[PDB]
């Protein structure tokens, strides 16, 4: 699936990018410490999974 | 060359190695934020 | 009289010089002066 590979790859990229910004702001704004524990936890699992998905697919296209 | 799968990513791969130096620039923007306290 | 925070103009200013300067280095490799 020449297309679904990159698709997941850009998802990693647009997500890393989201997280690069979000995690520092989230960490030092005192307001929503508890409203955000969720966000980064989900982002993180989502990030890791994305790396693995791209990992396995690479062995169908490279 | 990267493997052909990743050719749409070449121009971002070109800019990535300079990102370390921006961490140093970003430290100074930050002390300007806080005023060198 | 203080309506734009100094640190913003610095980063803006800063990045402004950084770009004119980078340009002069690109030109050292292109066109006039590049030995080519």
């Amino acid at each position: 699936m020449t297309i679904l590979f990159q698709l997941a790859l850009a998802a990693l990229v647009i997500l890393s990018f989201v997280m690069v910004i979000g995690v520092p702001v989230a960490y030092a704004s005192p307001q929503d410490w508890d409203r955000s524990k969720q966000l980064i936890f989900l982002g993180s699992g989502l990030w890791i999974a994305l790396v693995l998905v791209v990992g396995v697919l690479n062995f169908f296209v490279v | 060359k990267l493997p052909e799968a990743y050719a749409i990513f070449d121009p971002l791969v070109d800019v990535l190695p300079v990102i370390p130096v921006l961490f140093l620039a970003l430290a100074f923007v930050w002390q300007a934020a806080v005023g060198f306290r | 009289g203080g309506r734009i925070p100094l640190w913003i103009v610095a980063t803006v200013a800063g990045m402004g010089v950084i770009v004119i300067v980078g340009l002069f280095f690109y030109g050292a490799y292109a066109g006039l002066g590049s030995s080519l």
Partner: peptide
């Protein structure tokens, strides 16, 4: 082509000052 290169680093570069900018709005802990 090389404008590809310029837009990426323009974005990565703007990414830093943003965090600091966002964090002063929210009077976050700089």
């Amino acid at each position: 082509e090389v404008i590809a290169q310029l837009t990426m680093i323009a974005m990565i570069g703007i990414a830093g000052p943003m965090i600091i900018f966002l964090l002063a709005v929210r009077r976050g802990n700089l």
